[PDB]
Amino acid sequence: ELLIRKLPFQRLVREIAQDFKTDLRFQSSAVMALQEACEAYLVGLFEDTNLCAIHAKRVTIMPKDIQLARRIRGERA
Amino acid sequence: ELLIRKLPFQRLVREIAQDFKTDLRFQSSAVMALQEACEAYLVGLFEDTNLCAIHAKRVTIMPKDIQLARRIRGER
Amino acid sequence: ELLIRKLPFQRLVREIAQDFKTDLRFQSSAVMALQEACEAYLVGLFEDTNLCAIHAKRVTIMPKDIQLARRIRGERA
Amino acid sequence: ELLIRKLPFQRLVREIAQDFKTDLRFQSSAVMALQEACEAYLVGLFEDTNLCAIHAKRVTIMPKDIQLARRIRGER
Amino acid sequence: NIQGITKPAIRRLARRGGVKRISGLIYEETRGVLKVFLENVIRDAVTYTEHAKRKTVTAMDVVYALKRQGR
Amino acid sequence: RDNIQGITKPAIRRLARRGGVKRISGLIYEETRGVLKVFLENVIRDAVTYTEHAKRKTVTAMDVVYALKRQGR
Amino acid sequence: RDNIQGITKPAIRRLARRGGVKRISGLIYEETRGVLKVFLENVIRDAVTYTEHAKRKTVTAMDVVYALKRQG
Amino acid sequence: RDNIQGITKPAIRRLARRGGVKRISGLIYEETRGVLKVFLENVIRDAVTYTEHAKRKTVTAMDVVYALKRQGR
DNA sequence: TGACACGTGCCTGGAGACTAGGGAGTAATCCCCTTGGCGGTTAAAACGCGGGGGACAGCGCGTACGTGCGTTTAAGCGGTGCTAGAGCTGTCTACGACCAATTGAGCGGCCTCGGCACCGG
DNA sequence: CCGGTGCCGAGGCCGCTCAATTGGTCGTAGACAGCTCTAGCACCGCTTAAACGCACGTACGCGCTGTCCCCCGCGTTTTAACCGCCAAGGGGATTACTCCCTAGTCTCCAGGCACGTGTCA
């Protein structure tokens, strides 16, 4: 399944697209593939930040844990 | 600027290559590139494990920090 | 012989290579080896997914069967 | 940690080694490494047979599940 | 906009990621992270659309963008 | 059609028959195409690397053999 | 004198729990033991092969690591 | 000693200092050595493959650069 | 010759097997609609002759170009004994920050229709 | 030279889960100390970077030759896509069942250690 709601994600994607380029429409299948990819990326990042929190002798993940996970992974953070 | 000693690392490279293919001779430039890249990779891994140690309110890196850094980077 | 038609597989390989390096030109022997290897790999994958299908008491194979076969054999699934 | 008892594994590996060559002793470190390896292999095979059972509309793993997992992996 | 990825959705994503307990501030932080990710992928996606002179983003454009943002 | 469509439905059917498959879901064909594409991409990516190492412009059979060996094949 | 029976049922259950298994048929344990024996034989066979090549009489940790590599 | 011991404790300490590490547990050194072997093995495996593709008996710098690129460093 | 592995003994908590209880996941069956398998067909991409053109792979050779070695040394570097101190780690505490639950409702998703944007046979 | 597919916007319904507010509670950052371990000082060995000869395997570049890759026509060709009928079955529901999950107790033992003994490069 898809954990993120379809219509809000569509709206956000259209917002960022209109920021980049105007009158650049997306297919439903392209939006579905992009949403699947983003959900996979988010669940992977949450797995990594859960590993970070477990490493810090804790059970509740924090924003600094996600920051550390993204800094170690190699993203722009 | 090569922190690892040249002759021990060369001997290690030769030993590791004995398994893959026997009687293989390395160019000096090849061993230099291997040493430079291994040093850069170890420096990056140590930066990441130091970040992990600072995350846990510590200053002493521990093997669990190295395993965490390798698991996050996709190596474990 | 080769179950896959020669020219479609050749065109697909040439397209993938033109993605990777663009200027590449294939020998006939290289394309034949690629085709033989891909056919053998797909035959093995279909055999393993047939095992997975018979495991669930279904004569028909399903995409979930192939996903399971790739997950167990070590491939990314 | 380790989930298999150490002394029964020692006696088992001793009986298994007795067949090929008589009284070729093992360092305790080698026995511990082999036990860790068997631990990893068994837990991986049980994960695979759990995937098989979840794929077969079941929750209980069965001998046919682990046999199918081993045959798909390529062991036997 | 970015606020449409609601708090219970982010909680569900974290649950699927194996997270048992979740700080309240993560959600705002995660949203920022998500936006950056999306921007980057879409930027590449749009580049592919514009480079091919098709003006229509295709499913393949997105797949290629994602690959080149994860290779 | 896109070149991925050149791996036709009857070809995938034949591959499944050789694999001992008696009945085949309609979604198998698309799934197989995706899997095949991934496999091919990986092999060819290695193959082209080998080609570049030899400073050649023609991918040879040996390039493919090394790519296949270095993969699970 | 079966030594394979020293790997008890609760140990195999624990291994399955670590593998994420929630429910376990009773016959798996005997099956698992057979599987385990085969694995060990193969690994040890390679280990001993390496040992014999090295003409040593003490199997070392490196022998086992090489056996495992050449098996896995 | 075995060649893995040639990456000495002070060398690993120097690498850690350059990596910004201020304090180092005694168990790190052996662990680091293990990590290095895996990395080297992978790179060297590819390097030797390249050497074999060129039908050479001398591993060149270029073999290593291609191995390193394809192993992500 | 000196460090490492094997056989005995006690014992105490730590764990393994048994059977009492049961219930819940597993095993056999039916049919409903789905959906592959197969019969016809035709043409549209496949696939070998055939001239043909040639960019480029494969091989042979010269040459110097970089590898490996005998031998030194010395000196910067490593193994190590001992120490003072700085941090790891186990523990107490308390309170801001987490999890569940119900209630109005506000936006998702399905249903449908008017409108055009557009690369294309 | 116009056309079928799809996107955008709007009317309008159900529907279902979203936010807030409450309660409950918990678990984590700070303080505190026992421990331990380690960075460094100082000594003495050591073994590595470099420098001489010294010989030498061979990497690489250049050139020659063939040689198969690309090109198209093109005739045949044959089988892929599509459509329609036949019927095999996926599976959701149903009903029985049986055997595996707890688990307390009786009983076996893991290993800690303490010791004595034999062994191998």
Author numbering:
A (entry chain C), C (entry chain G): 59 to 135
B (entry chain A), D (entry chain E): 59 to 134
E (entry chain D): 25 to 95
F (entry chain H), H (entry chain B): 23 to 95
G (entry chain F): 23 to 94
Reported in the publication:
In the present study, we determined the cryo-EM structures of a nucleosome-like particle, the H3-H4 octasome, which has unique features not found in the canonical nucleosome. In these structures, an ∼120-bp DNA segment and four copies of H3-H4 dimers formed a stable core particle without H2A and H2B. A novel H4-H4’FHB, assembled by the helix–loop–helix regions of the two inward-facing H4 histones, connected the two disks. First, the H3-H4 octasome lacked the acidic patch provided by H2A and H2B, which functions as a docking site for a variety of nucleosome binding proteins.
Single-particle analysis identified three well-resolved structures, indicating that the H3-H4 octasome exists in alternative conformations. The three structures, namely the open, closed, and intermediate forms, were similar but differed by the clamshell opening angle of the two stacked disks formed by the symmetrical halves of the H3-H4 octasome. The closed form, with a resolution of 3.6 Å, was best resolved. The structure showed that the H3-H4 octasome has a core composed of two (H3-H4)2 tetramers, forming a left-handed ramp allowing ∼120 bp of DNA to wrap around the core 1.5 times. Each (H3-H4)2 tetramer engaged an ∼60-bp DNA segment on either side of the dyad to form a disk. In the nucleosome, the H3-H3’ FHB of the (H3-H4)2 tetramer coincided with the nucleosomal dyad; however, in the H3-H4 octasome, there were two H3-H3’ FHBs, and they were positioned at the superhelical locations (SHLs) +3 and −3 on either side of the dyad (SHL 0). Second, the αN regions of the two inward-facing H3 histones were predicted to occupy the interdisk space of the H3-H4 octasome; however, the expected alpha helical structures were not visible, suggesting that the H3 αN regions in the interdisk space are dynamic. Finally, the FHB at the octasomal H4-H4’ interface resembled the one at the nucleosomal H4-H2B interface. In the H3-H4 octasome, the same H4 sidechains were oriented in a similar manner, but they interacted with the sidechains of Arg92, Tyr88, Asp85, and Asp68 on the opposite H4’ instead.
